[PDB]
Amino acid sequence: MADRTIEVELPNKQRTVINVRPGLTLKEALKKALKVRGIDPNKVQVYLLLSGDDGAEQPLSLNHPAERLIGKKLKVVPL
Incomplete structure (x- = not known):
């Protein structure tokens, strides 16, 4: 699989990696993260950088x- 996960940078100069199938x-994948x-x-x-x-x-x-x-x-940043 090599890398079957997605990285998400949270607010407050913090970053966390999450896994999903x-x-x-993405919402259901971050549900527990935001929960x-x-x-x-x-x-x-949530925005994607290229x-x-x-x-x-x-x-x-x-x-x-x-x-x-x-x-x-x-x-992912608050609005």
Whole structure:
């Protein structure tokens, strides 16, 4: 598998890696992550960073399966 996980940078200069299988959306994959952290899905946003093709850090849908970007790094910040 090499690397079957997704990295997510949390607020407060903190970063954490989470694992998920191909089927559920990123929301369901971060549910437990935000559950223990007390973070709400309607109080935060996740963006994907690339370089200069995706506009550098762009928004993503909650119905987007991690499998669609397995291994890709993302950042989650409150709004």
